[PDB]
Amino acid sequence: IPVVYPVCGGLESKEIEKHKRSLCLFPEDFLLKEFVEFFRKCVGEPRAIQKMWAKRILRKESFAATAPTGVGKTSFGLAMSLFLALKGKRCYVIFPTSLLVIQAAETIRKYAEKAGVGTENLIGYYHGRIPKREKENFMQNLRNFKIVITTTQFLSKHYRELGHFDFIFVDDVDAILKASKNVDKLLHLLGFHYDLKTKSWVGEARGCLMVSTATAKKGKKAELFRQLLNFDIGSSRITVRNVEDVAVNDESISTLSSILEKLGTGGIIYARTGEEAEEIYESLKNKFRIGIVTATKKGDYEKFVEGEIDHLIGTAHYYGTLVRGLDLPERIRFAVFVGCPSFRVTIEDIDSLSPQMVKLLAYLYRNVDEIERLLPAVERHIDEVREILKKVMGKERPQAKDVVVREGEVIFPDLRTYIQGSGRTSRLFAGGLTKGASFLLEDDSELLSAFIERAKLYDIEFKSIDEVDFEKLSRELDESRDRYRRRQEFDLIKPALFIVESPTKARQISRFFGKPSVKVLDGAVVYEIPMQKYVLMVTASIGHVVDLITNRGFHGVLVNGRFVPVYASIKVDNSRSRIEALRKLAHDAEFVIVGTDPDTEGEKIAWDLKNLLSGCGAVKRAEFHEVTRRAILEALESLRDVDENLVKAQVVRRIEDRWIGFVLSQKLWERFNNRNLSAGRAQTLVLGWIIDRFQESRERRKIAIVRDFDLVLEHDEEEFDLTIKLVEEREELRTPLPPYTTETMLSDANRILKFSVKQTMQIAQELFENGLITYHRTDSTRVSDVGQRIAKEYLGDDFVGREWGESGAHECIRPTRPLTRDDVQRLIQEGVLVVEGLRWEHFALYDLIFRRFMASQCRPFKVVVKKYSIEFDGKTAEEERIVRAEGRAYELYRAVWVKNELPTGTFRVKAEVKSVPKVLPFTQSEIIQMMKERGIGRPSTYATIVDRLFMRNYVVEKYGRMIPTKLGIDVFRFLVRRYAKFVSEDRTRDLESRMDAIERGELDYLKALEDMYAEIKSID
Ligand SMILES: Nc1ncnc2c1ncn2[C@@H]1O[C@H](COP(=O)(O)OP(=O)(O)NP(=O)(O)O)[C@@H](O)[C@@H]1O
Ligand SMILES: [Mg+2]
């Protein structure tokens, strides 16, 4: 029952073309607007994110409030508390310090001092102060208070006897997670009574709870909030930053560290060891105001905070010891690292130490047969490795660039610390993200470099070289922080439901900014995290929310001088729920960003979404051809609107498969009644070629095989006398092959690795989804500037240009970072590149992609081609062969066949001879190429077409080659003999283009559908 803007038209069924109440209205919407106005009277204009919370609460939804500082969280809670009390709902606000409780009480009265009541029968607070009389007055009346504020302590002590609350607000969540019972005691207050008997609970949410993100340990106790309130807490670290990173190969206490101290003050220095730290204090004290910390004594911290001190010296270890691990958003302005934060592992150390710490070192090499522990019972045992280690390593020099070997000893750069250390230098506020600066000075050249390189892995980790504008810097910092102070006046950071296809993608992306807080809505999981651009709430559509219906109109299309696609919910869950789920989130954000795949189907999803979530909020489209923090941000800076052109091509293509597919398949059920049969045009065609290869394979059983020479001649004599007459022998050097494209990838994936095309696509997808390669569906070989810069960083000297193809807007399939298969595997073990469900096969694949690509950009290679002319039994054949090829490109991608060479000589031969087929049956690899050469099928379809044939039992494979079956044959011959004109290679090849055409905005879909509708009813 939907009007304005069941059955929405341009949500029972979406009846859409393309190019009196409201649609995105929720119940609590009238309860909200009141609240806003209310807020406008006690604090001001509700911030986007503050409005989103309200909704959550007005719908009684518990969750972990995660957002930038400076945003009015505390005010909200208080305010919202007061609002619910005016509705006689009662609320509980829990704080972690006496004063906060007091500040809180004031903040309410103040509000109330704006058309509010204020009566005693309203607010009641309690903390460690208060005397004989007011303590009594509290307990004896507690329960008639619509608002109860107290420290997080009073809770543990008096959970029982505290009434229940409709809304309970927790300021600091670590003030609770400290003691397990706190949790229990909270749910209790909400109506969740434990059941010793069942040893589990049971209960109905009486109210709703709202808590901050946590800074300290997690604990399996929090897990309780999941099964009970469908929500995980998650960190308030938020790994984003501005920060200017400067690298100096000099750590001179003099002409350097002190010249940097020219950069105003409030710098925090970090020294390798406590011992090394103090060694500076004296070196530097009669220049600049100092400070030193640690176990010994602090005080310098207060002196710093208060302004006495201008800087601080300490360790990555001790600074944490301080309050909040040392967090002064306004004071701290920059940090200098005296010595690259590193980790050490000695040659004579190997012995004792975590096995999962032996694996890492296990890599870094591999030269010999050490891969033989790679695959492992894991515990094939480290012991065997530790020993293997000792023996080899001194002389052997690894190839890595992120660490140093020297000579017996391996130095590990420690970025974790670095990030964390220079992170105090930049914070996320309602006003953006303070500017930072981190000066890392190290004398150990080789090491510094290793850091520098290792940094790259943590993206946004490039370093300058004192080629800094110091004058500006000092300003930006003092300026920037000035902003923060004025944080109370911004709201640049707003919510934005970011919809991606799969959960994998969801996770990968939300993690790009930290440990997001979760929430499980009626029909969907949402990972919400804050960042410089918005307060993302990445959620996964789980594919297409809707698909072509099967009843309405002609096979889904309303016709009669019309053509109007009809869409329906999908599919034991119904996708209608995800939509209903999505419209709610959308509702709360008032702004949606679809980030589905960068293809037509992807565009088709945003499209529907654009439609379905109408009214709710703007629905922009983020386009990126790789799933990586960097790409995503770039996208977040280049949003566009659904590209209608893609949709139309998305539609039409669909409609065909529906029409030409159904009707034909049907004709296959009418004859020799056997449903479960299937016709597809594209597949009938192929299936055809698949036959017109088999019928040709049962012939010309000629051929003879020499014993020494890799010779194969079409003859029929056992022994004989051959003649090798060396003719030509040129030395050619040329360009490698282009970077893979869906087509050729599926091929090499079949020829080299023995993967089926359905498998490879699956792998590719997962590889793509784990930010390791560009998008896998692509027919372009184009190489983005960035992509060249990737190769250059690996090849070096061997790196050539080669843009490869300069059409379309699509790019080839290739590595996202310069990282061989090992490097990846390593980093994964090392924990630098986190990913989901990847087995050998993936890297088996990732490997070829990397090679193919890096080859494409690599230098031309030298190949030696020696021709040969042979004459025997009156017959003389002349063939040419490759006897040798050398160069980088070949070491990476063995494109050419280096057959065996053969000195000239007319001597006595000994052949085995055999009865070989005229030709041999196609292999997924060859058949995939024909599909391209010939013009049939596309990246989104090559694999599917070929699969079908196998699953409809039309084809089977033998010796790794494709072979038809009667079932199939009789099938092929059926469609061919009687409807050959709908299956004509030409019709399919031309039609296959009308689509690309419509997609590029050249052919008209309407005028495209007529020819299709007509053509089809032409049999009905
Ligand atoms: N939406 C708003 N519009 C204008 N001013 C606001 C708004 N929300 C909060 N404030 C103000 O901001 C100040 C901080 O509010 P408070 O409840 O302490 O929020 P907080 O941001 O959670 N604190 P912190 O993150 O520690 O700065 C108070 O003066 C006001 O409530
Ligand atoms: Mg606070």
PDB file of N, CA and C in Angstrom, residues 355-356 359 373-385:
ATOM      1  N   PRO A 355      56.201 -20.508  18.317  1.00  0.00           N
ATOM      2  CA  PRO A 355      56.251 -21.218  17.036  1.00  0.00           C
ATOM      3  C   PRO A 355      55.676 -20.365  15.919  1.00  0.00           C
ATOM      4  N   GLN A 356      54.616 -19.633  16.255  1.00  0.00           N
ATOM      5  CA  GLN A 356      53.942 -18.761  15.305  1.00  0.00           C
ATOM      6  C   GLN A 356      54.802 -17.534  15.065  1.00  0.00           C
ATOM      7  N   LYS A 359      57.336 -19.163  12.017  1.00  0.00           N
ATOM      8  CA  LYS A 359      56.738 -19.211  10.695  1.00  0.00           C
ATOM      9  C   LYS A 359      57.243 -18.014   9.922  1.00  0.00           C
ATOM     10  N   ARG A 373      57.688 -26.775   4.394  1.00  0.00           N
ATOM     11  CA  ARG A 373      57.245 -26.630   5.765  1.00  0.00           C
ATOM     12  C   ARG A 373      56.170 -25.561   5.701  1.00  0.00           C
ATOM     13  N   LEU A 374      56.142 -24.853   4.571  1.00  0.00           N
ATOM     14  CA  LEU A 374      55.143 -23.823   4.329  1.00  0.00           C
ATOM     15  C   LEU A 374      53.827 -24.556   4.501  1.00  0.00           C
ATOM     16  N   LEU A 375      53.539 -25.487   3.595  1.00  0.00           N
ATOM     17  CA  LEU A 375      52.328 -26.287   3.703  1.00  0.00           C
ATOM     18  C   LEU A 375      52.558 -26.937   5.035  1.00  0.00           C
ATOM     19  N   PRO A 376      51.648 -26.754   5.986  1.00  0.00           N
ATOM     20  CA  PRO A 376      52.217 -27.503   7.097  1.00  0.00           C
ATOM     21  C   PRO A 376      51.192 -28.207   7.953  1.00  0.00           C
ATOM     22  N   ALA A 377      51.686 -29.121   8.776  1.00  0.00           N
ATOM     23  CA  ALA A 377      50.828 -29.768   9.746  1.00  0.00           C
ATOM     24  C   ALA A 377      50.911 -28.587  10.714  1.00  0.00           C
ATOM     25  N   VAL A 378      51.571 -27.541  10.198  1.00  0.00           N
ATOM     26  CA  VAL A 378      51.867 -26.278  10.861  1.00  0.00           C
ATOM     27  C   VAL A 378      53.043 -26.684  11.699  1.00  0.00           C
ATOM     28  N   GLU A 379      52.696 -27.498  12.679  1.00  0.00           N
ATOM     29  CA  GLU A 379      53.623 -28.053  13.617  1.00  0.00           C
ATOM     30  C   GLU A 379      54.268 -29.276  12.987  1.00  0.00           C
ATOM     31  N   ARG A 380      54.828 -29.117  11.786  1.00  0.00           N
ATOM     32  CA  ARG A 380      55.567 -30.229  11.189  1.00  0.00           C
ATOM     33  C   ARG A 380      56.671 -30.113  12.235  1.00  0.00           C
ATOM     34  N   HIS A 381      56.524 -28.994  12.935  1.00  0.00           N
ATOM     35  CA  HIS A 381      57.313 -28.511  14.032  1.00  0.00           C
ATOM     36  C   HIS A 381      58.332 -27.489  13.629  1.00  0.00           C
ATOM     37  N   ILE A 382      58.403 -26.492  14.492  1.00  0.00           N
ATOM     38  CA  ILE A 382      59.285 -25.365  14.362  1.00  0.00           C
ATOM     39  C   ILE A 382      60.694 -25.856  14.584  1.00  0.00           C
ATOM     40  N   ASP A 383      60.820 -26.819  15.478  1.00  0.00           N
ATOM     41  CA  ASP A 383      62.116 -27.365  15.778  1.00  0.00           C
ATOM     42  C   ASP A 383      62.921 -27.591  14.504  1.00  0.00           C
ATOM     43  N   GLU A 384      62.382 -28.388  13.585  1.00  0.00           N
ATOM     44  CA  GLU A 384      63.082 -28.685  12.337  1.00  0.00           C
ATOM     45  C   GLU A 384      63.460 -27.431  11.593  1.00  0.00           C
ATOM     46  N   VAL A 385      62.705 -26.370  11.827  1.00  0.00           N
ATOM     47  CA  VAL A 385      62.975 -25.112  11.154  1.00  0.00           C
ATOM     48  C   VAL A 385      64.074 -24.346  11.876  1.00  0.00           C
TER      49      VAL A 385
END
